[PDB]
From a paper:
To extend the structural coverage of proteins of unknown function, we targeted Pfam protein family [name] (domain of unknown function 1185; [name]) and determined the crystal structures of two representative members. Despite lacking any recognizable sequence similarity to other protein families, both proteins show significant structural similarity to proteins with a Bacillus chorismate mutase-like (BCM-like) fold characterized by a β-α-β-α-β-β core that includes a mixed β-sheet (order 1423) with the β4 strand antiparallel to the rest. The biological unit of both proteins is a hexamer and analysis of homologs indicates that the oligomer interface residues are highly conserved. Structural similarities to BCM and genome-context analysis suggest a function in amino-acid synthesis.
The [name] gene of the marine α-proteobacterium [name] encodes a protein with a molecular weight of 20.5 kDa (residues 1–­193) and a calculated isoelectric point of 6.2. The crystal structure of [name] was determined to 2.1 Å resolution using the MAD method. The final model included one protomer (147 of 194 residues) and 42 water molecules in the asymmetric unit. No electron density was observed for residues from the expression and purification tag, SeMet1–Thr2, Gly103–Ala115, Lys137–His145 or Gly172–Arg193. [name] also forms a single domain composed of seven β-strands (β1–β7; residues 4–17, 20–36, 78–85, 119–123, 130–134, 147–151 and 161–170), but with only two α-helices (H1 and H3; residues 48–69 and 91–97) and one 310-helix (H2; residues 73–75). The dis­ordered residues in the [name] structure correspond to a large C-­terminal region of BB2672 that encompasses helix H4 (residues 97–109), most of the H4–β4 loop (residues 110–115), the β5–β6 loop (residues 137–145), including the 310-helix H5, and the C-terminal region (residues 172–193) after β7, including 310-helix H6. However, this interface was not observed in the [name] structure, which crystallized with a single molecule in the asymmetric unit. In BB2672, the N-terminal interface is involved in the formation of the hexamer, while in [name], it is only involved in crystal contacts. The observation that [name] crystallizes as a monomer in high salt and acidic pH (2 M NaCl pH 6.5), while demonstrating the same hexameric oligomerization state in solution as BB2672 under alkaline and low-salt conditions (150 mM NaCl pH 8.0), lends further support to the hypothesis that pH or salt concentration might be a key factor in oligomerization.
Author numbering: 3 to 102, 116 to 136, 146 to 171
Write the structure that this text describes.
């Protein structure tokens, strides 16, 4: 149930007043999905763990494709999830449970709020989408840095 996928890349060529050559780069891939447990009180979150496994792989691959690198060339990784208002924080936990240690963060939010994705070699990258996550959604992110 993926409504939107978004990929953000950032290249830094000058930092602390110093020319960074080659530029250092960060990428983050984000998916907006329907939370099957929105509006509900459930204990068995298997369905979100299985969905998270596939998303991590999908978003991790989008990151490396965006940076045009092989996965072994990545310096840092991280992942986060923001649950919409009719979900629970445990839903974000579940979605982040499977392995892609890699830092992760979970938050509750609303459309347009910024999610900070940690980067463990914490540093980080901010992501947002103007219209996500809606109350019945989850916004999941995977980030990778290069160089």
């Amino acid at each position: 149930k993926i409504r939107k996928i978004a990929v953000f890349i950032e290249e830094t060529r000058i930092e602390a007043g110093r020319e960074i050559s080659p530029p250092t780069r960060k990428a983050v891939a984000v998916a907006v999905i329907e939370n099957p447990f929105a509006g509900r009180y459930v204990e068995d979150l298997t369905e979100l763990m299985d969905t998270g496994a596939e998303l991590g792989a999908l978003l991790g691959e989008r990151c490396v494709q965006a940076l045009g690198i092989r996965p072994e060339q990545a310096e840092s990784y991280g992942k986060s999830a923001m649950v919409g208002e009719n979900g629970e924080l445990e839903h974000a936990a579940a979605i982040l449970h499977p392995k892609l240690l890699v830092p992760s963060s979970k938050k509750m939010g609303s459309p347009g709020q910024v999610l900070d994705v940690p980067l463990g070699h914490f540093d980080g990258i901010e992501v947002r989408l103007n219209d996500a996550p809606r109350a019945n959604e989850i916004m999941v992110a995977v980030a990778v840095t290069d160089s």
